[PDB]
Amino acid sequence: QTGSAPNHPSDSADSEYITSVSIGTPAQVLPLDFDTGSSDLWVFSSETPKSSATGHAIYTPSKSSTSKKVSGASWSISYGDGSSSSGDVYTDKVTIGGFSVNTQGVESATRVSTEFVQDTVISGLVGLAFDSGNQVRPHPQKTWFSNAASSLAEPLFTADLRHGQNGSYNFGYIDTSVAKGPVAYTPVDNSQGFWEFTASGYSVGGGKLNRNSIDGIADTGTTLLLLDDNVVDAYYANVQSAQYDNQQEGVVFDCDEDLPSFSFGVGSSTITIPGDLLNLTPLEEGSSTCFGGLQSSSGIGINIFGDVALKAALVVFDLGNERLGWAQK
């Protein structure tokens, strides 16, 4: 038994990826942000202030014959970007790509921050990091993937993100037909609740991998590839027009640059992010200056293999073996 759910980029700069989720009986279809960097499944609902939820699809638990309020449960969360939300908790059937979890914790937001209010095309998050990170008190809720894992064909899911095109979030099987190389695995350290791994080294513009390893997290909920100042300096070293732009808070360069690839080692196997995928977006319509997909992680204190990196590969989040797989796309 498997699920396969199409996703799409929210905008021309692949800021975040949007996937439909069906909650309740009959199904209420919400667009949610699948986030392997967090552990709460939370939604805009009929209990979200109407001034915050207007224009967003919402979950109404009273219209679902399978909903149940979880007495005494509450949750609150703050994200990397300073956005936040909080509320109470229901259980309900949650179906993603045709596969159902029958009793899933659905965290109903009674307050959401301005960032979420403005993002009308998203109605919440599906946290896909480890259960230890879940913020429901007093009794944590398991993630949708954790609940599904024992019932799927295999306890794994894959991320297939694309630049400017639909992709897929699949559960319970590995569709390597979207890829041009085999899955290469490395072990995951879930000590901090994340899909944390070590890359064995990197290369800029297709030389041989060095052995300067990089510890970081695979995070579908982060737009950029965020690496330390030493790696960023190495990446941009021969991009002649590159410079830090204090308004953008990141490195920019002429849009017509022929950017080098950025490669990194998963065990001894190479995954290469082509230069095309390291040019995120023109600074504005018709601009001759573009913003790099690879930027510094100095501000956040952890390296993040976000969507820019994930786009280069089919990425296998294996909860059964606690390992992370990358197949070149």
Q: What secondary structure, in 3-state letters, does the chain show?
A: CCEEEEEEECCCCCCCEEEEEEECCCCEEEEEEEECCCCCEEECECCCCHHHHCCCCCECHHHCCCCEEEEEEEEEEECCCCCEEEEEEEEEEEEECCEEEEEEEEEEEEEECHHHHHCCCCCEEEECCCHHHCCEECCCCCCHHHHHHCCCCCCEEEEECCCCCCEEEEECCCCHHHCCCCEEEEECECCCCCCEEEECCEEECCCCCCCCCEEEEECCCCCCEEECHHHHHHHHCCCCCCEEECCCCEEEEECCCCCCCEEEEECCEEEEECHHHHEEEECCCCCCEEEECEEECCCCCCEEECHHHHCCEEEEEECCCCEEEEEEC
Domain boundaries, the chain: 5-174, 175-329
CB 37 within 8 A of CB 219: yes
Let me know if 193 is exposed, middle or buried by CB neighbors in 10 A (0-12, 13-18, 19+).
middle
All residues at 6 or more sequence positions from 231 whose CB lies less than 8 Å from its CB, including other chains:
202, 212, 214
d(CA 88, CA 105): 10
186's tokens: 């490395």
Pick the catalytic residue from 40, 219, 307, 318.
Answer: 219
All residues at 6 or more sequence positions from 327 whose CB lies less than 8 Å from its CB, including other chains:
176, 179, 180, 181, 182, 183, 184, 313, 314, 315, 316
Known catalytic residue at 119:
no
Cis check for the bond before 282: say yes or no (omega within 30 of 0): no
CB 200 within 8 A of CB 215: no
CB 172 within 8 A of CB 99: yes
CB 56 within 8 A of CB 122: yes
CA-CA distances (angstroms) from residue 98 to 6, 31, 51, 95?
11, 15, 32, 6
Residue written as tokens 């513009």?
A: 205
9's tokens: 């980029």
β partners of residue 183: 327
CATH fold of 5-174 reads Cathepsin D, subunit A; domain 1 (2.40.70)
CB 252 within 8 A of CB 242: yes
CB 201 within 8 A of CB 269: no
d(CA 299, CA 79): 14
CB 145 within 8 A of CB 99: no
CB 329 within 8 A of CB 272: no
Residue written as tokens 């953008």?
A: 248
Interior angle at CA 93, CA 89 and CA 99, nearest 5 = 135
d(CA 219, CA 239): 27
Known catalytic residue at 40:
no
The method recorded for this entry reads X-ray
d(CA 277, CA 163): 8
> What is the number of alpha carbons within 13 Å of residue 315 lying toward its C-beta?
27
- Alpha carbon dihedral 291, 263, 311, 233, in 10-degree steps, equals -20
Amino acid at 317: F
d(CA 51, CA 297): 34
β partners of residue 33: 125
CB 75 within 8 A of CB 87: yes
d(CA 176, CA 190): 25
Let me know if 3 is exposed, middle or buried by CB neighbors in 10 A (0-12, 13-18, 19+).
buried
CB 264 within 8 A of CB 278: no
Residue written as tokens 């949007």?
A: 18
* CATH code for the part of the protein at 175-329: 2.40.70.10
All residues at 6 or more sequence positions from 207 whose CB lies less than 8 Å from its CB, including other chains:
none
Cis check for the bond before 61: say yes or no (omega within 30 of 0): no
* Fold match flag (5-174 vs 175-329): yes
d(CA 13, CA 138): 39
Pick the catalytic residue from 35, 40, 119, 160.
Answer: 35
All residues at 6 or more sequence positions from 191 whose CB lies less than 8 Å from its CB, including other chains:
none
CB 159 within 8 A of CB 9: no
CA-CA distances (angstroms) from residue 182 to 162, 176, 178, 286, 316?
18, 7, 11, 39, 11
- Alpha carbon dihedral 176, 179, 180, 186, in 10-degree steps, equals -80
